[PDB]
RNA sequence: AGUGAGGGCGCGAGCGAUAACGUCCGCGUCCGAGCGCGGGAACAACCGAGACCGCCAGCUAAGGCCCCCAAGUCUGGGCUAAGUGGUAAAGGAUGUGGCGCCGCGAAGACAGCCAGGAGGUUGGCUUAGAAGCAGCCAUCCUUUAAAGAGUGCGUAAUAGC
RNA sequence: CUCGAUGUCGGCUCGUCGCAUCCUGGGGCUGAAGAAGGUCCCAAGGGUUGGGCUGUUCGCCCAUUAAAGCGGCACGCGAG
RNA sequence: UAACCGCUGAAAGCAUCUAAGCGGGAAGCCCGCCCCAAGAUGAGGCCUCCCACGGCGUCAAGCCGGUAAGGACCCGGGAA
């Protein structure tokens, strides 16, 4: 009824191999997990995740294999770029090539490196983020960077995802 | 915040989070860090 | 060379060139009112007038007798034991005082005044 | 990074604009007496000797163990792993460059047999209000039903001199390439005019 | 002729704090004084059981059968999965599984979605502002996406979600 | 159990484990600006001074100190 | 890895760090640091070297020389 419907457009390399499902698209040969009982098909344009039951384990498993391998696909279709925005009077940014310029620790050496699907985008640099491929590892690295200085609820000067409304509290007494 | 006990949520929409037998309430207000595991 | 409890000599605005220190002002584990150091004490000896009194200051380490061994293998020993009394900051006590030169002191540095102050023979 | 030696004696010297004290290291130059090829002793390494005490005196075995890659006529020998032999004979006439940091050790001069007194710190007990043991003696050793008995590994009286050991970092100070000698300002680890060795390890980030 | 003082366990009253391998009395068993065997790890009194002496005999208690060690790593149907097994209460909880029950307007559901979030809604005080999103209650009307006497981020009302 | 025998205090000397950790760090929280406090969960690693008076350990007081913890072992220690 | 922070994600067709799978992280845990150590009968591993030593009832795992192959003994010396 509902927790298993998805199409596999682009004629993507949509195949199941040694107990691992191989989703190959712009290159992201993404390895989407395959629980032995979940099971799925990709015929015509329709890709379906099945349920060898419906109890707790399985049902969640469904939500998963479905959503996550769904990922495998959408991903293999484009290229996974994380939109991110650096912003704060205290900070600098430029690709440098394969790292993380960055400067707001007032002893700025910030020489980072790009894991993989990770390409650096400095078009601002106020607006500035990265592109990845692997939705999981991408949101992640993004995070790594955010984390390393970003916080600031009461005074801003950080890195922000899309940049949530950053809830902020007063300083002294007024 | 934590307490080997109590926790009846709070922040009017304070979340009952299941994590590691960890009775941990998650919210949108630090005031509610409810760690009772 | 050192001591905890001590009958030491001074010669600043002293009540008497003598006070008894408790211990060393250094790294919590005294045991050595040592050459060129800074420590604690009260008076032992008398004091005609003088705004000094029978109180207690802290201050800095002069002479010793049991090896003033310096960086340059400069070497010495005076058959005398005494330091200069301090007022807070360190800023020495008296206008002058009876004694003289030699590395260790100035070297510790913080007290140049003592430095130029006790120069000549004695 | 290793030197094999006959430790001489400790003495004082001067450096820059100040004196300070060193020690006399002396080593003719050990040589590839035995090699653990790895396929040989996958604990790969070099064993060498560095002098020569009388030949008329020498077990056949020794004679041929030498035979091996054949070298000379001594008796001072020992081994160390993870150290290539970019040679087949070593001296130190450069082997050990000065103005460098080193680590080193040797035999440990042989003490005696003194209790709570020696062996360990804290000089014995006290003396006066009690003299039925005057000044020092053995601390305490356990108790009633705690473990219900006598303990098993706290310091103890006696023999504590016939052993060996080493010192962490020390300075290479100076190199005398002729008389294969080097001054190093060292804890003269163990006697002198006897046996020692040096090795260098310290990825120490200050 | 011997004990003329004894303890334990279960139930029933004392007492004690409804504490103690406490001490008081009673019904029973007990254990000594047989209570020497099984046994529960090993443990005087907790379930089994009375040993006159044999058996390189077989049926059984209790309680056991992957192994250490005799005995199915039986079959059958479940429910937990924390290692509970492998001591604990008060009490806490979108634990796990189970009821015996509630919402299904396929006049096609809920979390996810889209857009509008309607005009009198405009003081009552306070109006510096209520003109739902400042305090003492208001509980009506038209009007359609069906209607918020406006559950909520708020300041100067207000304006926006 | 112990009265055919179990040395009770205070201290000494050598201590050994323990965490409801004092200093240490790791932390979320603040009525958290900084700094600094204070509010809990994690973690014993090392560390966890001198004197004064008092036979008193506790204690009060002098001077510092990063700090100068509570306590288990017949309140460890007489075959020391 | 502790608390504590996150990524990807369902079962709770919006959400969640959370079984699934991934990461951050403590002066603490294994290592790295030195010091013991196959009497770790589960080593000995490598090097050199005397010979497979010589006589005795086969089962010769007993005798004697065998080798100074080597070492012990006594002597003489040692911060051992």
UniProtKB/Swiss-Prot annotation, chain A:
Provide one Gene Ontology cellular component. cytosolic large ribosomal subunit
**Record carries keyword Ribonucleoprotein:** yes
Q: Name one GO molecular function term.
A: rRNA binding
Is Ribosomal protein among this UniProt entry's keywords? yes
**Domain of life of the source:** Bacteria
Q: Which GO terms describe its biological process?
A: cytoplasmic translation
Query: Which InterPro entries does the record associate with it?
Result: Ribosomal_uL6-like (IPR000702), Ribosomal_uL6-like_a/b-dom_sf (IPR036789), Ribosomal_uL6_a/b-dom (IPR020040), Ribosomal_uL6_bac-type (IPR019906)
UniProt-listed Pfam families: Ribosomal_L6 (PF00347)
Q: Which Gene3D superfamilies match?
A: Ribosomal protein L6, alpha-beta domain
Entry keywords, A to Z: Ribonucleoprotein, Ribosomal protein, RNA-binding, rRNA-binding
Q: What is the role of the protein in this entry?
A: This protein binds to the 23S rRNA, and is important in its secondary structure. It is located near the subunit interface in the base of the L7/L12 stalk, and near the tRNA binding site of the peptidyltransferase center.
Q: Could you say which protein family the record assigns here?
A: Belongs to the universal ribosomal protein uL6 family.
Q: How does it assemble?
A: Part of the 50S ribosomal subunit.
Protein's name according to its UniProt entry: Large ribosomal subunit protein uL6
Q: Which organism is it from?
A: Thermus thermophilus (strain ATCC BAA-163 / DSM 7039 / HB27)
Swiss-Prot record, chain B:
Q: Which GO terms describe its molecular function?
A: structural constituent of ribosome
Q: Name one GO biological process term.
A: translation
Per UniProt, what is one Pfam family of this protein?
A: Ribosomal_L36
Q: Does the keyword Transferase apply?
A: no
Keyword Kinase in record: no
Q: Which GO terms describe its cellular component?
A: cytoplasm; ribonucleoprotein complex; ribosome
Name the keywords, alphabetized.
Answer: Ribonucleoprotein, Ribosomal protein
Highest rank taxon of the organism? Bacteria
Regarding protein family, the annotation reads:
Belongs to the bacterial ribosomal protein bL36 family.
- This protein is called Large ribosomal subunit protein bL36
Swiss-Prot record, chain C:
One Gene Ontology BP term is:
translation
InterPro entries, alphabetically? Ribosomal_uL14, Ribosomal_uL14_bac-type, Ribosomal_uL14_CS, Ribosomal_uL14_sf
Pfam families per the record? Ribosomal_L14
Instruction: Check the record and name the SUPFAM superfamilies matching this protein.
Output: Ribosomal protein L14
State the oligomer form and interacting partners.
Answer: Part of the 50S ribosomal subunit. Forms a cluster with proteins L3 and L19. In the 70S ribosome, L14 and L19 interact and together make contacts with the 16S rRNA in bridges B5 and B8.
Family listed:
Belongs to the universal ribosomal protein uL14 family.
Name under which the protein is recorded:
Large ribosomal subunit protein uL14
Q: Which organism is it from?
A: Thermus thermophilus (strain ATCC BAA-163 / DSM 7039 / HB27)
Give the classification, highest ranks.
Answer: Bacteria, Thermotogati, Deinococcota, Deinococci, Thermales
Swiss-Prot record, chain D:
Q: Which spans of this chain does the record mark as coiled coil?
A: none
Which terms in the GO cellular component ontology are assigned? cytosolic large ribosomal subunit
Q: Which InterPro entries match?
A: Ribosomal_uL3, Ribosomal_uL3_bac/org-type, Ribosomal_uL3_CS, Transl_B-barrel_sf
Q: Is the keyword Transcription in the record?
A: no
Q: Name one GO molecular function term.
A: structural constituent of ribosome
Tell me which Gene Ontology terms the entry assigns under biological process.
translation
Instruction: Look up keyword Ribonucleoprotein and say if it applies.
Output: yes
Which keywords appear in this protein's UniProt record, sorted alphabetically? Ribonucleoprotein, Ribosomal protein, RNA-binding, rRNA-binding
- SUPFAM superfamilies in the record, alphabetically? Translation proteins
> What does the protein in this record do?
One of the primary rRNA binding proteins, it binds directly near the 3'-end of the 23S rRNA, where it nucleates assembly of the 50S subunit.
How does this chain assemble?
Part of the 50S ribosomal subunit. Forms a cluster with proteins L14 and L19.
Query: Sorted alphabetically, which PANTHER family does this protein's record hold?
Result: 50S RIBOSOMAL PROTEIN L3 (PTHR11229), LARGE RIBOSOMAL SUBUNIT PROTEIN UL3C (PTHR11229:SF16)
NCBIfam families assigned: L3_bact (TIGR03625)
What does the sequence similarity comment in the record state about its family? Belongs to the universal ribosomal protein uL3 family.
Entry protein name: Large ribosomal subunit protein uL3
């Amino acid at each position: 009824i509902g927790r298993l419907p998805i199409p596999v457009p682009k004629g993507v390399s949509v195949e199941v191999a040694p107990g691992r499902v191989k989703v190959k698209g712009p290159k992201g040969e993404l390895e989407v997990p395959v629980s032995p009982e979940m099971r799925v098909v990709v015929e015509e344009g329709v890709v379906r995740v099945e349920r060898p039951s419906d109890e707790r384990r399985h049902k969640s498993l469904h939500g998963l294999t479905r959503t996550l391998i769904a990922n495998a696909v959408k991903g293999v279709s484009e290229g996974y770029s994380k939109e991110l925005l650096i912003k704060g009077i205290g900070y600098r940014a430029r690709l440098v090539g394969r790292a993380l310029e960055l400067t707001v620790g007032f002893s700025h050496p910030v020489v980072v490196e790009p894991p993989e699907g990770i390409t650096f985008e400095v078009p601002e640099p106020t607006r500035v983020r990265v592109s990845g491929i692997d939705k999981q590892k991408v949101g992640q690295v993004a995070a790594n960077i955010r984390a390393i200085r970003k916080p600031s609820a009461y005074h801003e000067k950080g890195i922000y995802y899309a940049g949530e409304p950053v809830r902020l509290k007063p300083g002294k007494a007024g | 915040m934590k307490v080997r006990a109590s926790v009846k949520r709070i922040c009017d929409k304070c979340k009952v989070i299941r994590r590691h037998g960890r009775v941990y309430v998650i919210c949108e207000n630090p005031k509610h860090k409810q760690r009772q595991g | 060379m050192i001591q905890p409890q001590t009958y030491l000599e001074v010669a600043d605005n002293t009540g008497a060139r003598k006070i008894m220190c408790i211990r060393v002002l250094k790294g919590s584990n005294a045991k050595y009112a040592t050459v060129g150091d800074v420590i604690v004490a009260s008076v032992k000896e008398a004091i005609p007038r003088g705004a000094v009194k029978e109180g207690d200051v802290v201050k800095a380490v002069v002479v010793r007798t049991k090896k003033e061994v310096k960086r340059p293998d400069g070497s010495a020993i005076r058959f005398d034991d005494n330091a200069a009394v301090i007022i807070n900051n360190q800023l020495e006590p008296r206008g002058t005082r009876v004694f003289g030169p030699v590395a260790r002191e100035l070297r510790e540095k913080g007290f140049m005044k003592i430095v130029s102050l006790a120069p000549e023979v004695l | 990074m290793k030197g094999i030696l006959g430790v001489k004696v400790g003495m004082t010297r001067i450096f820059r604009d100040d004196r300070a004290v060193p020690v006399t290291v002396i080593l003719a130059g050990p040589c590839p007496v035995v090699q653990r090829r790895t396929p040989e002793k996958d604990g790969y390494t070099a064993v060498q000797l560095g002098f020569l005490p009388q030949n008329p005196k020498r077990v056949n075995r020794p004679l041929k163990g030498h035979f091996a890659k054949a070298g000379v006529e001594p008796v001072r020998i020992l081994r160390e792993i993870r150290d290539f032999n970019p040679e087949g004979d070593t001296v130190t006439v450069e082997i050990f460059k000065p103005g460098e940091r080193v680590d080193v050790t040797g035999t440990s001069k042989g003490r005696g047999f003194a209790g709570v007194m020696k062996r360990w710190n804290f000089a014995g007990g006290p003396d006066s209000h009690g003299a039925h043991k005057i000044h020092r003696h053995p601390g305490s050793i356990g108790n009633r039903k705690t473990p219900g008995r006598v303990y098993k590994g706290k310091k103890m009286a006696g023999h504590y001199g016939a052993e060996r050991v080493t010192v962490m970092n020390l300075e290479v100070v100076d190199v005398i390439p002729e008389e294969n000698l080097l001054l190093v300002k060292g804890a003269v680890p163990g006697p002198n005019g006897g046996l020692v060795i040096v090795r260098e390890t310290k990825k120490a980030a200050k």
